[PDB]
Design a protein around this ligand. Sequence first.
Ligand SMILES: CC(C)(C)S(=O)(=O)C[C@H](C1CC1)N1C(=O)[C@@](C)(Cc2ccc(C(=O)O)cn2)C[C@H](c2cccc(Cl)c2)[C@H]1c1ccc(Cl)cc1
Length: 100
Amino acid sequence: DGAVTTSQIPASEQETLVRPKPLLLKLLKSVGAQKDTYTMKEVLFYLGQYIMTKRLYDEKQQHIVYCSNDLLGDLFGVPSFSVKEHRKIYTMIYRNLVVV
Ligand SMILES: CC(C)(C)S(=O)(=O)C[C@H](C1CC1)N1C(=O)[C@@](C)(Cc2ccc(C(=O)O)cn2)C[C@H](c2cccc(Cl)c2)[C@H]1c1ccc(Cl)cc1
């Protein structure tokens, strides 16, 4: 368990409670998550752990994640994305859960 936060998104939005649909829930459980209801910053921590463990960000100054051949690309619906465009990342995650 853990959290990952950003100044690009209001802090209160990062505390939003969400119930992942089945694919997102599986990715979280694969790196140690134990429940069905999370905050958005917990979802970003587990997704970061998932990105590390699956070796999807080994070049630490590149700023782009390539995911077209991973579960992540199916989840988000894109082949790659910038790690710096935080609002766009939140939009993609919201499509994969029910907000409480
Ligand atoms: C393990 C950590 C080092 C703690 S990490 O920060 O999670 C690493 C993770 C990368 C994808 C693996 N990651 C980043 O590297 C970061 C630092 C990339 C970054 C670099 C520079 C700038 C800037 O100059 O504006 C902005 N963003 C942060 C990114 C992140 C963090 C919180 C929310 C969001 Cl939406 C994104 C954040 C990230 C990006 C996408 C997702 Cl889905 C999850 C986390």
